């Protein structure tokens, strides 16, 4: 019946900066909208009930406003505790969510590459890891090369949560392939793209 169009899908902003996410409804819903905050790994937390009512234990910078069909949540001066996902709720219907984090000066990733252990090769499998350390924004593009042959569909990557102190992300990408398949090539590289990089960076090793 009801549809909650929340936006933007994502946004970034500097400390002490004003952030406003908005929710729209396919129909008029009076004040029957609630806002939540969900930090990574934790249960959601109610911020604003019935569109405008702030809840006890919720910093003043947090404000909910709206009525009828148009609603929004606002954080006066954005703080580092406020990094999380925020979604609206209309009874059992939830908005799409807005991921918000700290906007810092674009930063290049400190890159490192790791061959597979010899212990792993005995298993008949080989994992090649490519580490990206302390960069921003979260966006990036790691693509594996085996003898200058881009690999795709055999890699899995994993990012951390934005560090609190420095406000950076770090990313681990694993290229997996069989023991026998690994021994067929020599040059193994991580091709990396990012705002903080003037040119796509390569980090490689020669098998053995």
């Amino acid at each position: 019946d009801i549809q909650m169009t929340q936006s933007p899908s994502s946004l970034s902003a500097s400390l002490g900066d004003r952030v406003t996410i908005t929710c729209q409804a396919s129909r008029g819903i009076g004040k029957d909208l609630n806002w939540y905050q969900q930090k990574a790994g934790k249960a959601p937390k109610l911020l604003v009930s019935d569109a405008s009512t702030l809840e006890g234990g919720v910093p003043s910078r947090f404000s909910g406003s709206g009525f009828h069909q148009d609603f929004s949540l606002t954080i006066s001066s954005l703080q580092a505790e406020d990094v999380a996902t925020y979604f609206c709720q209309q009874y059992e219907t939830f908005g799409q969510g807005t991921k918000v984090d700290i906007k810092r000066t674009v930063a290049a990733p400190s890159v490192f590459i790791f061959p597979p252990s010899d212990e792993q090769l005995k298993s008949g499998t080989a994992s090649v890891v490519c580490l990206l350390n302390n960069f921003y924004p979260r966006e990036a593009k790691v693509q594996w090369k085996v003898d200058n042959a881009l690999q795709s569909g055999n890699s899995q990557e994993s990012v951390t949560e934005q560090d609190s102190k420095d406000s950076t992300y770090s990313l681990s990408s694993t290229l997996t392939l069989s023991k026998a398949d690994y021994e067929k090539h020599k040059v193994y590289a991580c091709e990396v793209t990012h705002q903080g990089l003037s040119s796509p960076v390569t980090k490689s090793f020669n098998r053995g």
């Binding site: 029957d32 609630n34 939540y36 249960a43 959601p44 937390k45 109610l46 009930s49 019935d50 809840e55 006890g56 234990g57 979604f87 709720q89 009874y91 059992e92 939830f94 799409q96 969510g97 400190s110 490192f112 590459i113 790791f114 061959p115 597979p116 252990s117 212990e119 792993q120 298993s123 994992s127 890891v129 580490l131 350390n133 899995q156 990557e157 994993s158 990012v159 951390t160 770090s170 990313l171 681990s172 694993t174 997996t176 090793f205």
Partner: protein, 217 residues
Amino acid sequence: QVQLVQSGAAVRKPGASVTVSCKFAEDDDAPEHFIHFLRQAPGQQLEWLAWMNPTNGAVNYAWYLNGRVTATRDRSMTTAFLEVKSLRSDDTAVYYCARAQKRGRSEWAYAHWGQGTPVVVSSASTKGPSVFPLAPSGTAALGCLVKDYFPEPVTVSWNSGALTSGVHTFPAVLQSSGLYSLSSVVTVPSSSLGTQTYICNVNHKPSNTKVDKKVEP
């Protein structure tokens, strides 16, 4: 603002069922607010499942669940239970119990939350991880590859907790095999590589697996 208390994480084969419990009041201390159950699948939006009225067991289940879900409460009406039958892999999620604050009107403003109950639906068997070294090549990085375990979670400490200043333990990823992997990497100056031992301590409680891997150049 009090957190409700939910039962521990659960693992299930497809076709099976699980029951999550949620203690929402003390037995010993306005119609009561209903207990709501929801779940959030990994990297997904929260999904409402049902409410249960602890006063008379009245219930409302999300229609698309097709009668697969059942909610009840104990005799004292201090604890709610959610039963999910005919589990499929995509029932894998964290299950939450939630409830509105008692001095509020909206049944839907979830002020109180359980800490959540991870439910993993998979046909993979319990398995301890193998831990392979990530040998470091001014500042060098080194880590551990925690490979092929089930189910989550594993916890990773460096030097029996000693050092954390420069540790990036990444979220586990699910491989096509149905098993998990994660990496834990550590930043350190180069000078140190030949003076101080670096052991990553890996514990996977579900398989009762402990390991102490020394990472050397």
